[PDB]
Enzyme design. Sequence first.
Site, PDB file in Angstrom:
ATOM      1  N   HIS A  97       2.405  -2.824  -4.761  1.00 45.88           N
ATOM      2  CA  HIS A  97       1.881  -1.783  -3.512  1.00 45.88           C
ATOM      3  C   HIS A  97       2.519  -2.379  -2.275  1.00 45.88           C
ATOM      4  O   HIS A  97       3.119  -1.814  -1.526  1.00 45.88           O
ATOM      5  CB  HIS A  97       0.451  -1.998  -3.450  1.00 45.88           C
ATOM      6  CG  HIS A  97      -0.224  -1.649  -2.150  1.00 45.88           C
ATOM      7  ND1 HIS A  97      -1.078  -0.622  -2.062  1.00 45.88           N
ATOM      8  CD2 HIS A  97      -0.065  -2.350  -0.991  1.00 45.88           C
ATOM      9  CE1 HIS A  97      -1.573  -0.678  -0.726  1.00 45.88           C
ATOM     10  NE2 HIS A  97      -0.961  -1.538  -0.198  1.00 45.88           N
ATOM     11  N   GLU A  98       2.671  -3.796  -2.418  1.00 46.72           N
ATOM     12  CA  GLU A  98       3.630  -4.730  -1.211  1.00 46.72           C
ATOM     13  C   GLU A  98       5.010  -4.377  -1.140  1.00 46.72           C
ATOM     14  O   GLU A  98       5.417  -3.877   0.037  1.00 46.72           O
ATOM     15  CB  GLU A  98       2.969  -6.138  -1.182  1.00 46.72           C
ATOM     16  CG  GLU A  98       1.622  -6.178  -1.183  1.00 46.72           C
ATOM     17  CD  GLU A  98       0.918  -5.653   0.157  1.00 46.72           C
ATOM     18  OE1 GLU A  98       1.796  -5.406   0.986  1.00 46.72           O
ATOM     19  OE2 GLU A  98      -0.311  -5.374   0.507  1.00 46.72           O
ATOM     20  N   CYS A 124      -5.379   0.265   2.098  1.00 44.38           N
ATOM     21  CA  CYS A 124      -4.284  -0.446   2.973  1.00 44.38           C
ATOM     22  C   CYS A 124      -4.705  -0.775   4.305  1.00 44.38           C
ATOM     23  O   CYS A 124      -5.213   0.082   5.080  1.00 44.38           O
ATOM     24  CB  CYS A 124      -3.219   0.654   2.853  1.00 44.38           C
ATOM     25  SG  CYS A 124      -1.391   0.185   3.660  1.00 44.38           S
ATOM     26  N   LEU A 125      -4.279  -1.905   4.767  1.00 47.62           N
ATOM     27  CA  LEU A 125      -4.684  -2.305   6.111  1.00 47.62           C
ATOM     28  C   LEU A 125      -3.994  -1.251   7.331  1.00 47.62           C
ATOM     29  O   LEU A 125      -4.491  -1.008   7.960  1.00 47.62           O
ATOM     30  CB  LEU A 125      -4.152  -3.780   6.605  1.00 47.62           C
ATOM     31  CG  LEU A 125      -4.839  -4.679   5.613  1.00 47.62           C
ATOM     32  CD1 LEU A 125      -4.508  -6.158   5.909  1.00 47.62           C
ATOM     33  CD2 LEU A 125      -6.487  -4.609   5.883  1.00 47.62           C
ATOM     34  N   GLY A 133      -3.394  -8.415   0.192  1.00 52.90           N
ATOM     35  CA  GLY A 133      -1.888  -8.597   0.222  1.00 52.90           C
ATOM     36  C   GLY A 133      -1.318  -7.872   1.631  1.00 52.90           C
ATOM     37  O   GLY A 133      -1.917  -7.208   2.473  1.00 52.90           O
ATOM     38  N   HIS A 156       5.670  -1.052   0.676  1.00 47.56           N
ATOM     39  CA  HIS A 156       5.897  -1.444   2.400  1.00 47.56           C
ATOM     40  C   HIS A 156       7.164  -1.884   2.719  1.00 47.56           C
ATOM     41  O   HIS A 156       7.673  -1.218   3.520  1.00 47.56           O
ATOM     42  CB  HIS A 156       4.944  -2.356   2.583  1.00 47.56           C
ATOM     43  CG  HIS A 156       3.515  -1.700   2.787  1.00 47.56           C
ATOM     44  ND1 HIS A 156       3.174  -0.818   3.539  1.00 47.56           N
ATOM     45  CD2 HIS A 156       2.402  -2.336   2.374  1.00 47.56           C
ATOM     46  CE1 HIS A 156       1.816  -0.616   3.653  1.00 47.56           C
ATOM     47  NE2 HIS A 156       1.396  -1.409   2.774  1.00 47.56           N
ATOM     48  N   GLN A 167       4.555  -4.143   7.965  1.00 47.60           N
ATOM     49  CA  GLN A 167       3.418  -3.808   8.654  1.00 47.60           C
ATOM     50  C   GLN A 167       3.063  -4.419   9.968  1.00 47.60           C
ATOM     51  O   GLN A 167       2.157  -4.160  10.707  1.00 47.60           O
ATOM     52  CB  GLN A 167       1.974  -3.972   7.654  1.00 47.60           C
ATOM     53  CG  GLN A 167       2.301  -3.359   6.388  1.00 47.60           C
ATOM     54  CD  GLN A 167       1.278  -3.832   5.608  1.00 47.60           C
ATOM     55  OE1 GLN A 167       1.218  -4.413   4.241  1.00 47.60           O
ATOM     56  NE2 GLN A 167      -0.079  -2.956   5.667  1.00 47.60           N
TER      57      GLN A 167
HETATM   58 NI    NI Z   1      -0.660  -1.406   2.081  1.00 49.78          NI
HETATM   59  S   LIG Z   2      -1.666  -3.803   3.012  1.00 48.36           S
END
Ligand code: NI
Ligand SMILES: [S]
Length: 162
Positions: free
Chosen positions: A132-133, A90-91, A45, A136, A50
Amino acid sequence: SVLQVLHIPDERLRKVAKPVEEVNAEIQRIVDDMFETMYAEEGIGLAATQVDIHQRIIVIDVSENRDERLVLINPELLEKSGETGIEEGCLSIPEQRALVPRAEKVKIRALDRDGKPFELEADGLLAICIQHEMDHLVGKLFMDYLSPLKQQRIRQKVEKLD
Ligand code: NI
Ligand SMILES: [S]
């Protein structure tokens, strides 16, 4: 195009996305560039926040084949129940995983990649991922769900890497 993904500590991950106004060609380029970025980084995701675009856009792929495209523009949680939680990553918080509490089942509406709305009832890894997204998009990261202790250990381990 692949986009750089911001890493903590970055104040731009704390910014609160404004809704997408008109779903158009330009909004569609962002989408595909986020998909490209999301696969390139082997993530399930991604949120525009981000990649430092501050609109309410989310791309997801929770399939084990990596071939099932899901887009959430201006999403809106309508219902939820239960608790669940898995080891999340998480990226934007490179190489740190922890378990985080989530609603088990979510029911959202949103406009799709053509601008047409849809409702979606979700559980399993999709419900975790939608939550989760959307976090963000409102400046929240998953490590916020943890004691200040673990939160400092997480920033320390991310200093080193980068
Ligand atoms: Ni994330
Ligand atoms: S992410």
